[PDB]
Paper text:
The four point mutations that allowed evolving EGFP into rsEGFP2 (T65A, Q69L, V163S, A206K)16 were thus engineered in Superfolder-GFP, yielding a new PTFP that we named rsFolder. The on-to-off switching was triggered by illumination of crystals with a fibre-coupled 488-nm laser. Models were refined at 1.45 Å (on state) and 1.50 Å (off state) resolution for rsEGFP2, and at 1.50 Å (on state) and 2.35 Å (off state) resolution for rsFolder, respectively. The experimental Fourier difference maps provide evidence that in both RSFPs, off-switching indeed results from cis-trans isomerisation of the chromophore. However, a drastically different scenario is seen in rsFolder, where Tyr146 is replaced by a hydrophobic phenylalanine, one of the mutations inherited from Superfolder-GFP. Consequently, the switching pattern exhibited by rsFolder is unique. In the on state, the phenolate oxygen of the cis chromophore is H-bonded to Thr204, a water molecule and His149. Upon isomerisation the interactions with the two first partners are lost, while His149 and the phenolate oxygen remain H-bonded, resulting in a trans conformation of the chromophore that is a mirror image of the cis conformation. This highly unusual mechanism results in the off-state chromophore of rsFolder remaining tightly attached to the barrel scaffold and likely explains its exceptional thermal stability. First, the thermal stability of its off state (~64 hours) is 15 times higher than that of rsEGFP2 and, to our knowledge, unprecedented amidst RSFPs.
Numbering used by the authors: 3 to 65, 69 to 232
Write the structure that this text describes.
Amino acid sequence: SKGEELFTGVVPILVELDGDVNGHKFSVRGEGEGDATNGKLTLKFICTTGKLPVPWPTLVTTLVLCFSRYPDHMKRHDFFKSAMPEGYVQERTISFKDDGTYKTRAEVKFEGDTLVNRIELKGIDFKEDGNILGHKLEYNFNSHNVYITADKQKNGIKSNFKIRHNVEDGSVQLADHYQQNTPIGDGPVLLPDNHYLSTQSKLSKDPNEKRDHMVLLEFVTAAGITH
């Protein structure tokens, strides 16, 4: 694909989220860089409206899978890069078991030389005592495989998966993701055979930063295709 050539090296990233959870309005802004050659992603996020009303880990999936390393033999199954530079829409429903639901719509696309992920998030039916509004989740993010399938009808891809968030008390908060991606342009895109992305993520803090923030290191690498 032509989009793919855009990802030949380190690409600078902008992320912008406008959120509303149970009425609590907040905004997140993130900056950094991605490298699809090595499947590597480094981002620093700041809650620009003050304290974040939800826990940072819950926003990880929402806050650029075009930066997944697709191995050479899988290059033809890389929807995400193929939709660039005009980009793609990534919509999700995230149901937190026994708790509220995020609904998200994002556009991931190049603006100038910068890959931008611009997100609207609405959160509803959250329990004030729950693990989310109650900030009961550990500051981390498990390794995880997410399965990608083609959606020929929508000319894109879809994915269902469960994210397991560790709770303080040693239990697990499940977050059921239903995901759909569709091209923003009307050019041709790569529709993949079934495969999955292998994710590892490291959450940390900038010791110099006073604002409520997350430093995120991510590796994502496609797999599951025979040869």
